Symmetry: C5
Subunit: 346 residues, 5 copies
């Protein structure tokens, strides 16, 4: 009969004394809050900052006996967020926020329904910029594991406990994809119960596995790394006589790799350890330096020399020919097969 | 007689009991809300982020019987937004906001008029930064289809339904243009009714087709890609004798394309698949590498050699001349005609 | 006697019934609002965004008969903005805001005085970031005309009309200058009365003419464009015999222009049409390519050749000398005189 | 006895009628407000924007007879900013704000004490981003004079007047330094009384003198400008015979200066006039172009030529030797001594 | 019995007269406030700005006799931050904020418990962007000491005093690390009691020592600095006869160092003094300039010359050979051993 908001005026109003400043089950067991998330947006995973932005629908559920309506004939009584500041709400924060905000476009993006037995479904749209430290040992073939963990800031573990629900604690949007990663379907769910000099607080955290789309880096970095090598090999297929041709083909290619390695770590943090993309472009350096270093041997032995003179110099230009025409493709290919098996096993 | 705002004090005030926290037609059919938009601003379509900013006038219309004034002699009773927080308003949010805000310069940019029969026109200026994933298979000749979709966050499909109005659901400003695209006049309008573990919610979405102005990329990228080829052809129109001239004209041009392809994907996301602008600048690579690779053949056969010697070496420098003087323009032009027909058919 | 704020407690308070939610002259003629602006800041005209930031003092004046004090012995009764939310205020917004904000440092930067006959002077400091589409046909010699237009968002043309005042509708700060433009003193003032599917609304807009300081671009772009040409001419003043000197002076200069044109459109939007700065740096390309193309002719005819042989080859190296020693300065200067007259007439 | 805040409940409360909306000395002389500042932070002087950020403690002092407590036995009655919105406060704004904000971390950073005779000390932490137009005639040796000026926005000069106090109107933090400038101890204090079509308003402004640390620019710009010159001089100490060595040493150095001047005005606004750093790097251009221009003379006269032939050509290669071996160090050093005295006198 | 929030309605409410605007121990000794922090986030130490962002849990403790509950049977009475604006709170600000904000995601991240004897534990999550001037004498091997200092803004030293607690005044997160530094465990704690023309205020500050991960700079900067040297040494292992080979290997390497030093101070403020990374890359300059300077000697003495002629020129090419083949590795290695011991002792 009476309008339910008018019903809720006495549901939680000064009549019946719903004090929003006192958790349910006061002085009893803690408040068991089941949580799950829904991921609209995901991406902008900046490694310069080692964070990422997500746009989730945080759903919470707890049981408040003070909210147990009985007269009403249905199961759910939704209510606009205008009085969402009227009921008790758990102080779930994100232990690695690094910035977050509500969405208030045309309305507070909030949801509030209440079952007969006091079950409170509480859902709000959030945009987080979560911090996840990036492990970059094997950079272009890394599997980053960024996390988001939900703690309680004020209430201790003996008054408020979080939990994930079993029926799909983490849903993802239907066509949600990324420009650079693959959000692997397996998603871990484990506790991260904290301790301070103030007490112990509740935590739960879902670990998102991330694997890179190697297609991009395969193009901008590896192929340019690979052309300079083959360009540095036919430089040895140059004319037999040492002329300024090898003078050009040598230093030109080395200068490429010098600039390549510059833009190599362009959008990369200043990590002290050595990653995998650079040792590729390191080995690519010492081969292209082998070219200018090899002609040093040729131009050295050539200026040495004349029967016995030319008979021994060209004998050096020949053994140096039949070796470099296969040695560079020999070690460079054996290096490649070893490099990629090292990273195809992780 | 009485001032209508003073009339509205009893229109929605505590007299007559207009509770703003209870939707119209409560416990009856859902609230049928017709929507349309008006686009002032449009642009800043960043592909680094794959989003875009728009400045719209969202108009809504629903019928609230509680707002049915009868005494008054006219059709419309506008009212400043100061009491726009006084009436019920649907919680239309944008399912792909990624940031949005109201405009509050000198007044809340809001509009509110009410017909005799309870029709509520509600219009507000909004600045959205909407997320649209970019498909970049054929990059400079792509037709991106960015969308904006209007969902309800709290009310389920059985209590609130959105709809587009038939009489021009999407107007565009008179001289609205873009720096890079053409907002095609055809604009699609279809439902995107959602489902969650909470229920099903209303959605409507308008698909904006976008086609690129190819004029820019035709200049900064293609012509510089095209000069290096012709510069790499008259390099073969060099003197007959193999001199360091071809030493210069070869590696110089190849270094251009190396730097060209660097700035090629300058403002482009790190997409794993291969787009169309790069295979252009890829084929431009393997021709300019053909130049330095061709002189490798010339300088190789030249150092081989003398009656029978010169009689067979210059016979190779001639067949290599009459072929390269037409072969590069042969395959390069046939490539061009094939490339552009592949992209003039989409 | 009584304090005038205490006087204004009954001026607009619940006594005498000043309802701030009802415009003056209700049900009568529209409210004639005269406006003018004062420009403190102006600049940051970003062409990457095609907008600009301004810091104005928007003065408004309308007549409200409800504000007609009679007892008081003076003309003006100022009042701090603390009760500036107490009176009626027109909802003037900026039709091309693209971001704007009030200034609230140590006080709301607001002004409010009221004449005896109800005249309301209302002035507030605003920082706008206004959108003006840039026309870049003739880029370094363009005259951009950015605008700012003042519309009413809620009230229709039959209830509220804006106007500029005749006595200097737009003042500019005394020493206000720009880093790149000259704010021409002539400032246009014309209506932009709008129409929608909701009605017709009031508008007024002041067109600011802007002309560029060509001094900067004359230095960073044109001179470097001009040195490469003269460097590409004395390259032909090289030794008579074709040596690797022309091998160097040719490709070196062309590589400059390639990088010049890269940084040419560095801070420029991706406009499809062709502007004027590039056709300059385009013509500068085809002359420097003429150098490497000319030596192609020299090195070609030289390798052709010997009495009749040298007697006809050097006859070609001579006619090619007396022509290129004046032809490049011939066409290049005639091009310059034509280019600058094309742009000195607009 | 009674708690002084409870004392201030009747100090300014509805008892005794302290109306915060009415300035002291109403209808009498204007309110004489003495001001001074204290500078915590200072820096981020961006010339791309021509502004700078400061973090000051604005102290104000005015006398309000309505605040004259008599019963109390002490001189000062501080009070937390919670009731700082309760008293009258002057509307001091900053005429060149360009952005400013309060600091609200753990409390509004505000101070409020009141002497017996009504003296109000009012102090608040502010972070300003003030606009100062930069004069860049002599760029690396410029003395910028940025200002900050304190106006009143609402009250006219006949109702409110600002003043600096004599006892150290501008204090600076003890170890406050800058990365690029030296905040000279002399700080000017003069009025900037304004006039509009609304009246005349109070102003005071303190002029901060700033002088650059020339040490940085002496390293990144001048030394690289200076190495290319000496590298372009020993290029003339090359072998007597004109070989491709001068072919290399000439164009290589000129290309450096071309890229040097690119990054010269890297972080510099697009000012039309010519500054001092560029004419340095301009004169450095025309000397390095003299090198490639000089070898043009050598390679020209060399190809001219043979008894009388070589007897006159080498006579030109000798007079060109004994001159260039001292002429470049002659004019270049005389240029340096003239350049630096032009800028050591300002 | 009664709900404690309802108990706190009379704990601090208008009954019993808890005036939040009056510090504890009024007119007595100052309020002794013990503080400690807990560091979640730490990093983004930008030297371009010379600041850094931290995410701390500021815990405060003071004793307020007015908050002494006696009836209740326990030690602690937590309470949600909804009434955290109800009690007195010290106005601790950060003397070098440069920007800071609260975290309000799903609740104000705040904590409030009260012991029986009035002890108030008050803890709030804060994100600071603190200013620390960077000392960059020895840049890649520097030990920066950034600070954060906690002052009181309003209350003087005779009414409010801060202190650190002895039991671990500064805790750090368990796995908190940085991308570039090592937060040394030793953390200093000393007073910074201030003085102004208003009085003396309380301060405490914790000095965080920071030492760099030299691993990154060891790779991007030093190795490229080191390859050019060895590339500039085997350039002297070139053929005995002076050919254009040394023409290439000389200027090519010098151009590398020119571009190296460009990107050397890429992300570095414009400090006037000379740091350590540049004198490394300065000494690397004058060795690679020694190469092109050395061949100047070779090509000079070579063109001088013929029995006595060649007998004295090659005698110079030999003593120049046996010296440069060890002199560059001689001085360069002795330089290295001296450089690194200068920086391994600090
Ligand atoms: C929130 O969930 C926790 C997790 O179960 C609940 O704690 C558990 O509550 C049950 C119900 O009383 C306890 O069962 C009893 O345990 C005692 C001692 O173990 C046993 O002797 C009894 O026969 C009975 O089985 C259980 O011990 C207790 N466990 C823990 C770890 O707390 C809690 O009650 C829930 N609170 C709410 C408000 O839902
Ligand atoms: C909002 O619009 C929807 C769409 O039409 C309305 O739902 C429709 O309402 C009509 C009016 O009663 C229903 O017509 C009746 O349907 C029954 C069963 O189909 C039929 O036996 C009756 O003879 C009569 O035609 C219609 O069924 C119903 N359809 C749906 C899908 O809901 C709704 O009433 C509107 N609500 C408001 C508040 O305007
Ligand atoms: C705001 O300014 C407009 C512009 O003038 C005012 O509208 C004009 O008001 C005058 C005053 O009554 C009207 O004059 C009368 O016009 C009728 C019909 O044209 C004529 O027969 C009468 O003899 C008399 O001249 C005028 O028509 C009217 N014009 C328009 C276009 O509205 C308006 O009254 C002003 N409102 C306020 C509140 O100041
Ligand atoms: C704020 O400071 C100004 C600056 O002094 C005060 O104005 C001055 O007030 C004195 C005090 O009455 C005036 O002195 C009188 O001047 C008249 C005419 O000059 C003279 O005949 C009298 O013998 C007496 O000396 C002075 O003229 C006046 N000057 C100005 C420029 O206003 C003002 O009173 C101060 N207001 C407050 C609230 O402190
Ligand atoms: C906050 O902590 C300070 C630091 O101790 C307290 O100040 C100290 O308070 C004690 C307690 O009365 C004073 O002791 C007395 O000192 C006098 C003179 O020195 C001596 O003759 C007495 O026999 C007795 O020892 C002590 O002097 C005083 N020192 C200072 C520097 O203030 C303060 O009382 C504490 N306040 C609160 C509210 O906890």
């Amino acid at each position: 009969p009476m309008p339910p908001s008018e019903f809720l005026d006495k549901l939680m109003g000064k009549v019946s004394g719903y004090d929003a400043r006192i958790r349910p089950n006061f002085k009893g067991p803690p408040v068991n809050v089941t949580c799950n998330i829904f991921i609209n947006s995901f991406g902008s995973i900046a490694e310069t900052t080692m964070d990422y932005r997500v746009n989730i629908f945080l759903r919470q559920q707890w049981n408040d006996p003070r909210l147990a309506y009985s007269e009403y004939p249905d199961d759910s009584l939704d209510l606009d967020p205008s009085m969402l500041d009227s009921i008790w709400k758990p102080d779930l924060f994100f232990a690695n926020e690094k910035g977050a905000n509500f969405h208030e476009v045309t309305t507070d993006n909030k949801l509030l329904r209440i079952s007969k037995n006091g079950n409170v479904l509480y859902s709000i749209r959030i945009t987080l910029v979560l911090a996840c430290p990036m492990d970059l040992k094997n950079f272009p073939m890394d599997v980053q594991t960024c996390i988001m963990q939900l703690e309680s800031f004020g209430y201790t573990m003996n008054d408020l406990i979080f939990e994930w629900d079993e029926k799909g604690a983490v849903q993802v949007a239907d066509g949600l994809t990324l420009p650079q990663f693959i959000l692997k379907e397996e998603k871990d769910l484990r506790y991260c119960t904290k301790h301070y000099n103030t007490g112990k607080f509740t935590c739960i955290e879902a670990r998102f596995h991330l694997e890179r789309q190697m297609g991009y880096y395969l193009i901008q970095m590896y192929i340019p790394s690979l052309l300079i090598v083959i360009l540095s090999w036919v430089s040895f297929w140059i004319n037999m006589d040492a002329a300024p041709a090898r003078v050009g083909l040598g230093i030109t290619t080395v200068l490429t790799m010098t600039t390549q390695s510059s833009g190599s770590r362009a959008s990369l943090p200043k990590v002290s350890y050595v990653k995998a993309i650079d040792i590729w472009m390191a080995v690519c350096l010492l081969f292209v330096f082998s070219a200018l270093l090899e002609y040093a041997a040729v131009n050295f032995i050539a200026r040495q020399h004349v029967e016995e003179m030319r008979k021994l110099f060209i004998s050096r230009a020949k053994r140096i020919d039949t070796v470099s025409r296969v040695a560079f493709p020999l070690v460079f290919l054996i290096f490649n097969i070893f490099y990629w098996i090292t990273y195809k096993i992780i």
